[PDB]
Design a protein around this ligand. Structure first.
Ligand SMILES: OC[C@H]1O[C@@H](O[C@@H]2[C@@H](O)[C@H](O[C@@H]3[C@@H](O)[C@H](O)O[C@H](CO)[C@H]3O)O[C@H](CO)[C@H]2O)[C@H](O)[C@@H](O)[C@@H]1O
Ligand SMILES: OC[C@H]1O[C@@H](O[C@@H]2[C@@H](O)[C@H](O)O[C@H](CO)[C@H]2O)[C@H](O)[C@@H](O)[C@@H]1O
Length: 479
């Protein structure tokens, strides 16, 4: 066995790219060629009790469970293949020893006892063909999963349906959870299962954001119709370089930002830049999580001594860190007068107040200049008050209508800045002391300033409100 040790599972074989039929010998062999960890397929049983491979219960209009296999042979798939028998599928996979065969037993549309029998026959067929080492099982029917585990105690078995606790599954000796990916977008489903020793798979994951999300949280497998795109995404993901996720807010809660992750900076006293906004305290009008992302909303609204309200969220003393990859996926608010920022301040200010203990601006944008997004470091020697800050600006296509990934990678000796994995700035540790390099322990800040010394130079377009900065996630990786 030269098993492939990657996360790619080819949903119904590798069928889509080369226009093969789903759940076919062609699509399975293509999955072997690509080097997938596994190739996934679906099993039904004919009326005359022959196991065959097809997702739907009707193969070209014939109800599999109610017709003879001979009846199904009157139909031909797009590449000329007939409906494969399970035996033919398992023997084709037997001819190679690098990718697993992920067998799905479909719940019977006839009866639970029939489907338990299907399960009996599937396990017997794996044993008769001696391919027990290739085959791993998934099912929507919890009873079939447990029946497999009775017949094969060391079998790999994962459950697909979603409504059983990770704690119960480990009790019943299942080895993985395999839910639709939306299911995991509730509280710590992934970490929970891994804590208990279950592998984590997710199905059908065809789009890049969900791929990068599942990789960031280090799932074991991803079932996809886009295995070639997934290999590409694995190469460019932070785990490929040794980054491990330490902390994330995927903003999958609804309501106010989580108190375990975010505190509020509150007040309208200018924030050192003569800014025009009052940052409010736990007010859903300026900070709200909904539909999978954080909304920071600036409003043209009098409050106390200011004409605008907004929000400034900080992880100070909730998540503080030194070194790492900081990744924030964000869509910027449009309009002259706005000054959104994604940045970081030191938690303890070991060298004195700003700018002596530093600041890192992962993303700054002033709405009067739409074609520039900026990254900047500030130190005692290199800051904007004395006109010595070290920073660069990149033009970003469509900053207001699509998400972009604003990122830093922060090491003992330098900091790299990225916009959508384009590196555009490196700040090197000069090794001449803390006035040149104060970086030892910081936290994150998301805010939408209005006006101010930088952002207000050309006035505020009072028509742009309400103005929303959307943040898909904040992820912090470390080595
Ligand atoms: O601490 C006293 C010192 O405060 C200064 O106010 C600074 C702000 O200039 C500073 O501004 C931030 C940028 O430097 C940063 O890197 O980008 C962010 C986001 O866009 C800005 O908020 O913020 C710090 C920390 O809150 C303030 O202390 C005064 O300008 C200066 O006169 C005063 O001595
Ligand atoms: O004033 C706060 C901001 O200062 C910026 O430095 C430069 C500005 O002083 C100048 O007016 O605009 C240029 C644009 O290239 C800035 O680089 C910092 O870049 C910001 O981090 C800081 O918030």
């Amino acid at each position: 066995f030269n098993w492939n040790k990657n996360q790619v599972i080819a949903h119904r074989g590798a069928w889509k790219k080369n226009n093969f039929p789903q759940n076919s010998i062609a699509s399975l062999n293509e999955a072997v060629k690509l080097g997938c960890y596994g190739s996934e397929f679906d099993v039904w049983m004919t009326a005359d009790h022959i196991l065959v491979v097809n997702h739907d219960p009707e193969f070209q209009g014939l109800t599999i469970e109610k017709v003879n296999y001979a009846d199904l042979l009157t139909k031909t798939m797009s590449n000329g293949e007939k409906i494969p028998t399970l035996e033919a599928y398992l023997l084709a996979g037997k001819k190679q020893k690098s990718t697993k065969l992920i067998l799905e037993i479909k719940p019977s549309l006839i009866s639970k006892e029939r489907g338990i029998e299907v399960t009996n026959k599937c396990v017997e067929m794996v044993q008769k063909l001696k391919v027990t080492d290739w085959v791993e099982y998934i099912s929507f029917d919890y009873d079939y999963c447990k029946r497999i585990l009775t017949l094969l105690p060391n079998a790999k078995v994962a459950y697909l349906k979603g409504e059983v606790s990770a704690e119960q599954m480990k009790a019943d000796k299942l080895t993985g959870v395999d839910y639709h990916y939306s299911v995991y977008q509730k509280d710590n489903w992934i970490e929970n299962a891994q804590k208990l020793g279950l592998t984590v798979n997710a199905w059908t994951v065809n789009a890049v954001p969900e791929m990068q999300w599942l990789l960031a949280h280090n799932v074991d497998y991803i079932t996809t119709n886009e295995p070639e795109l997934l290999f590409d995404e694995i190469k460019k993901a932070p785990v490929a370089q040794g980054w491990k996720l330490k902390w994330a807010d995927e903003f999958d809660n609804s309501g106010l930002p989580l108190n375990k992750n975010w505190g509020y900076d509150v007040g309208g006293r200018g924030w050192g830049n003569n800014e025009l906004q009052y940052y409010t305290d736990a007010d859903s009008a300026n900070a709200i999580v909904k539909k999978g992302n954080l909304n920071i909303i600036a409003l043209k609204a009098e409050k106390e001594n200011r004409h605008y309200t907004s929000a400034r969220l900080v992880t100070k003393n909730k998540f503080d860190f030194k070194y790492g990859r900081v990744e924030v996926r964000a869509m910027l608010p449009k309009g002259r007068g706005l000054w959104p920022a994604i940045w970081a301040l030191p938690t303890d200010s070991k060298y004195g107040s700003w700018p002596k203990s530093g600041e890192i601006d992962i993303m700054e944008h002033v709405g009067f200049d739409p074609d520039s997004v900026h990254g900047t470091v500030h130190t005692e020697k290199f800051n904007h008050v004395i006109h010595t800050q070290v920073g660069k600006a990149l033009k970003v296509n469509n900053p207001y209508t699509e998400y972009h990934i604003y990122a830093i990678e922060w090491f003992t000796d330098h900091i790299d800045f990225f916009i959508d994995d384009q590196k555009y700035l490196t700040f090197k540790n000069t090794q001449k002391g803390s006035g040149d390099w104060p970086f030892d322990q910081n936290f994150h800040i998301l805010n939408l300033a209005v006006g101010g010394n930088w952002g207000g130079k050309k006035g505020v377009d009072d028509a742009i409100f309400p103005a929303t900065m959307k943040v898909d996630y904040v992820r912090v990786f470390q080595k």
